[PDB]
Design a protein around this ligand. Structure first.
Ligand SMILES: CCCCCCCCOCCOCCOCCOCCO
Ligand SMILES: CCCCCCCCOCCOCCOCCOCCO
Ligand SMILES: CCCCCCCCOCCOCCOCCOCCO
Ligand SMILES: COc1cc(C(=O)[O-])ccc1O
Ligand SMILES: COc1cc(C(=O)[O-])ccc1O
Length: 374
């Protein structure tokens, strides 16, 4: 039922951000999600809403929008609604939403999430197969209260009428393997095709995983961001045992151009994605090593750590070719497991970025999040 199965989730997010090239930002966010149930019947009808509000505290950062003078706003926010319709094992949503698909990953790396306006269909009528398609005609950046036309990261000022997509994922092999094929079009800017293989296998105490991906990009229509021709391949491999996980990522961009994506979106589909980049400049070859540990092994359940290092070379940018870069990320995340503060999450992380072709910097963040649900 519409009211029966309705859930309300509120997240309080206190976010401290520092980047030393020392500049600083501190802010408080509120993210309110109201998700109804579905009316009973052949066509079920529902409504989702999202409320976003951020407040500046005394002190990228992209935590808050900037005034024209370059001064961060005191506060910002917006409210979005989406209608939902369900039939059998298929759903259509229309309005404002948070798309999380391989060709369009909504960003939530700062204070409030990026949202999009459009429609999205998910259909699971055949066992193991999920079909998706949709179109988004406006976007609200993570650091904006407003909606604007979409554009590509490679030319953020060149606007498009919208982003269309369709894709399929098939999961099989006792749920161990998944294949994905996706096609997207940012109208008059670029078209992108993507293939993905996910696979996991247990060898004794080890869990071995692979995430292989291939993107192929070209300009579309009027080609407002210029001519584009790119392909990007990555393989991210994991080996887990007990409380430990090890990763090796390998990636290469080829062709005339870098890898394409929608401006403001997250780079997290890419194998070597890190906090401050994903090594997708034209021609760029990169590798990554990563280690994760679950500190329950030291009597600290709820505490998890990650360290990762990535290096890119052969990078072509406007300035020149043969560019090199590296990033090192470290994170400790703690989630309170029990007691009055249960579910409270504290994440502390640090990134060091060095680039032969751009500015070097270190970055420190502390994010304290508390979820309430009723
Ligand atoms: C599928 C696996 O991906 C193949 C492409 O990966 C290329 C390997 O990258 C070489 C890393 O060394 C250069 C980093 O600076
Ligand atoms: C400027 C670098 C300071 C980082 C020191 C390391 C502290 C956090 O590392 C936790 C490693 O977790 C292991 C996984
Ligand atoms: C991993 C370690 C990396 C090293 C980085 C140094 O309510 C919550 C109160 O907020 C507390 C934080 O506010 C203080 C920031 O000004
Ligand atoms: C528009 O409001 C919502 C959107 C979403 C989403 O798209 O994932 C989730 C919960 C919401 O309340
Ligand atoms: C000269 O600047 C850099 C060089 C390298 C390198 O040689 O691997 C890496 C990152 C840099 O920022």
């Amino acid at each position: 039922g519409f009211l029966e199965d309705a859930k309300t989730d509120l997240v309080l997010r206190n976010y401290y951000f520092n980047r030393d090239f020392l500049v600083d930002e501190w802010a408080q966010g509120f993210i309110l999600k109201f998700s109804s149930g579905y009316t009973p019947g052949t066509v079920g009808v529902g409504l989702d809403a999202i409320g976003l509000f951020g407040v500046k505290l005394n002190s990228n950062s992209e935590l808050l929008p900037l005034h024209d003078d370059g001064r961060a706003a005191d506060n910002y926010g917006r409210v979005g609604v989406a209608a939902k319709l369900r039939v059998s094992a298929s759903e259509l949503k229309i309005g404002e939403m948070l798309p999380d698909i391989p060709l369009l990953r909504y960003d939530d790396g700062r204070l409030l999430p990026q949202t999009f306006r459009g429609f999205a269909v998910v259909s699971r009528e055949l066992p193991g197969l999920a079909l998706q398609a949709g179109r988004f005609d406006a976007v609200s950046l993570r650091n904006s209260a407003d909606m604007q036309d979409l554009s590509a990261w490679s030319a953020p000022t060149q606007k498009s009428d919208g982003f269309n997509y369709a894709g399929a994922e098939y999961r099989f092999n006792r749920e161990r393997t998944q294949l994905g094929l996706w096609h997207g079009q940012l109208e008059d800017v670029y078209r992108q095709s993507y293939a993905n293989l996910l696979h996991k296998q247990r060898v004794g105490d080890w869990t071995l995983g692979a995430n292989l991906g291939l993107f192929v990009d070209r300009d579309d229509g009027a080609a407002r961001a210029g001519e584009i021709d790119s392909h990007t391949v990555y393989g991210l491999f994991s080996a887990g045992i007990g409380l430990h996980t090890f990763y090796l990522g390998l990636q290469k961009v080829g062709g005339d151009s870098g890898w394409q994506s929608v401006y403001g979106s997250s780079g997290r589909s890419m194998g070597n994605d890190m906090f401050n980049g994903n090594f997708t400049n034209a021609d760029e070859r990169s590798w990554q090593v990563r280690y994760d540990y679950d500190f329950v092994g030291l009597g600290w359940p709820g505490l998890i750590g990650m360290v990762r290092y990535g290096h890119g070379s052969n990078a072509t940018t406007k300035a020149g070719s043969g560019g090199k870069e590296w990033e090192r990320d470290v994170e400790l995340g703690y989630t309170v497991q029990s007691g009055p503060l249960a579910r409270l999450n504290v994440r502390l992380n640090h990134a060091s970025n060095r680039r032969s072709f751009n500015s070097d910097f270190d970055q420190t963040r502390l994010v304290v999040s508390y979820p309430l649900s009723w």
